[PDB]
Amino acid sequence: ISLEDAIKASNYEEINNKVTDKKMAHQALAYSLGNKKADIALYLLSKFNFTKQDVAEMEKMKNNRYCNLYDVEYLLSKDGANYKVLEYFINNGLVDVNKKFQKVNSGDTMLDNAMKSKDSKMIDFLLKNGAILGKR
């Protein structure tokens, strides 16, 4: 099965066979965010030590449609199903809360996504961590 198929199926034996280093964990985390598999995302974050450098590398990934179309910060914040992953990334300092999107909705921030979705818990979490809206 493909890596994305294993993630969609929560097939941990196949995920653990396939994801042996951080380069593959980048792909796996992007597919987990794109498919709203927060369980698998947090599993990967418990197995590999993600850093700011890893986020930078995810922004340049080959052949991953989610990181091709979207900023990592957009993936973290567009769907409330990924809130615990957003929490991890902000609490561990892996992303700038006010990064301006470059690949989609250029100039927006994570708080723009949270406000649009009217996700009260995400809005409050972001505001508590200094979030502002994108400028123009």
Curated annotation (Swiss-Prot):
It comes from the Bacteria. Changing residue 104 to D: Strongly reduced interaction with host CASP4/CASP11. Abolished ADP-riboxanation of CASP4/CASP11. It is found in: Secreted; Host cytoplasm. Disruption phenotype: Host cells display increased pyroptosis. Changing residue 126 to A: In delta-Ank; impaired interaction with host CASP4/CASP11. Abolished interaction with host CASP4/CASP11 and ability to prevent host pyroptosis. ANK repeats lie at residues 24-53, 68-99, 106-135. ADP-riboxanase effector that inhibits host cell pyroptosis. Acts by mediating arginine ADP-riboxanation of host CASP4/CASP11, blocking CASP4/CASP11 autoprocessing. This prevents CASP4 activation and ability to recognize and cleave GSDMD, thereby inhibiting LPS-induced pyroptosis. ADP-riboxanation takes place in two steps: OspC3 first catalyzes ADP-ribosylation of target Arg, and then initiates a deamination to remove one N-omega group. Interacts with host calmodulin (CALM1, CALM2 and/or CALM3); specifically interacts with the apo form of calmodulin, preventing calcium-binding. Belongs to the OspC family. This is Arginine ADP-riboxanase OspC3. The lineage of its organism: Bacteria, Pseudomonadati, Pseudomonadota, Gammaproteobacteria, Enterobacterales. The gene is ospC3. The chain holds residues 346 to 481 of 484 of the full protein.
